[PDB]
Curated annotation (Swiss-Prot):
One of its GO terms (biological process) is chondrocyte differentiation. GO terms for molecular function: ATP binding; enzyme binding; MAP kinase activity; MAP kinase kinase activity; mitogen-activated protein kinase p38 binding; NFAT protein binding; protein phosphatase binding; protein serine kinase activity. The modification Phosphotyrosine is found at Y172, Y313. This is Mitogen-activated protein kinase 14. Changing A47V: In a gastric adenocarcinoma sample; somatic mutation. It is found in: Cytoplasm; Nucleus. Brain, heart, placenta, pancreas and skeletal muscle. Expressed to a lesser extent in lung, liver and kidney. It comes from Homo sapiens (Human).
């Protein structure tokens, strides 16, 4: 057991192993505050997230377990993984805090590309890495569900990692602009292809410097989407299990799909072709990450032998109802059994 020391970081008392030094706030994280630090044992700049009240409720305790389980599973260059997880607690009885450690990323995509049109080569590379990470994530039957520029971190080398797998979804907000229509409007049980829709939106924005579907609200956004991809056909309509949603869709005037070559004027014809394959209304028909990687647009980056898949991921716990202390004990076992990556 390492020796821990205490430090107050913005009215918060952090207790971390001595190996972590120079803790400095970098902002908020998903359900916890994040500090950048230097891991003297590995020489890595890391981000340390102290979870806020990890076990205050069943929902929080299960979310804490979920995040730890997911982070402990993700081992891929284009996905945020775990370098360390610790608690100053000496026993399950005293267990109350959880700290998660990851590589420190330089900036999120949003802050880098905001209002800026990128060069085709840069788009090729950024999207290639997103799809490579997605192939890995999807191979484990994991769906990201909230892919957007702010959840994509990049370093100075444009090296990219996917991270962070309602009032905040209302209005003119980027929190909803990259969502596939079927999840935005709860049309049906959605699959991993919702993530491909998000990549298409991100890719279009990198190419034009403009949000693809910057709706002022959910409906305005759907209209922007249908004007581009066309209103659904009978085949897709049958798949919208939500009768309410299906019924509203049917009230819209039919529109044929636009010519993407005339929307993305001047864009590489191959980028155009890939966008048309990702931004397909029917999720059953969207190109998969594995198929997209093999698309000619990524000819200069694709390598079938360097696009790994993940080990199987058991998420049977998602359908389990346990007590706070049971989720807490399962989380403790996962913290205690953690083995750092080489
Ligand atoms: O929340 C997180 N934020 C990060 N930020 C940066 N860099 C930021 C980018 C935005 C900039 O404004 C400040 C530095 N790098 C890595 C993470 C990792 N990270 C995380 C995810 C899951 C579990 C634990 C953690 Cl710490």
């Amino acid at each position: 057991r390492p020796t821990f020391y205490r430090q107050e970081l913005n009215k918060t008392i952090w207790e971390v192993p001595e190996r972590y030094q120079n803790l400095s706030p970098v902002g908020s994280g998903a359900y916890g505050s994040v500090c950048a630090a230097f891991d003297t044992k590995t020489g890595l700049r890391v981000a340390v997230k102290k979870l806020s009240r990890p076990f205050q409720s069943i929902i929080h305790a299960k979310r804490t377990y979920r995040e730890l389980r997911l982070l402990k599973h993700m081992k891929h260059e284009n996905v945020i993984g775990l370098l360390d997880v610790f608690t100053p607690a000496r026993s399950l009885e005293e267990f109350n805090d959880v700290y998660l450690v990851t590589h420190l990323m330089g900036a999120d995509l949003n802050n880098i590309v905001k209002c800026q049109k990128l060069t085709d080569d840069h788009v090729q590379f950024l999207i290639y890495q997103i799809l490579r990470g997605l192939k890995y994530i999807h191979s484990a039957d994991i769906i990201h569900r909230d892919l957007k520029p702010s959840n994509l971190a990049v370093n100075e080398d444009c090296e990219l990692k996917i991270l962070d797998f309602d009032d905040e979804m209302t209005g003119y907000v980027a929190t909803r602009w990259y969502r596939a229509p079927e999840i935005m409007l709860n049309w049906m049980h959605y699959n991993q292809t919702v993530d491909i829709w998000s990549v298409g939106c991100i890719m279009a924005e990198l190419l034009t410097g403009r949000t693809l579907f910057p709706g002022t609200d959910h409906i305005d956004q759907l209209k922007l989407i249908l004007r581009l991809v066309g209103t659904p056909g009978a085949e897709l309509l049958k798949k919208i299990s939500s009768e309410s949603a299906r019924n509203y869709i049917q009230s819209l005037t039919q529109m044929p799909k636009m010519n993407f070559a005339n929307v993305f004027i001047g864009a590489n014809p191959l980028a155009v072709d890939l966008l048309e394959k990702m931004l397909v209304l029917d999720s059953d028909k969207r190109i998969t990450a594995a198929q997209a990687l093999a698309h000619a647009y990524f000819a200069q980056y694709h390598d079938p032998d360097d696009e790994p898949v993940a080990d199987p991921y058991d998420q049977s716990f998602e359908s389990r109802d346990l007590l706070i202390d049971e989720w807490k004990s399962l989380t403790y076992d996962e913290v205690i059994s953690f083995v750092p990556p080489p």
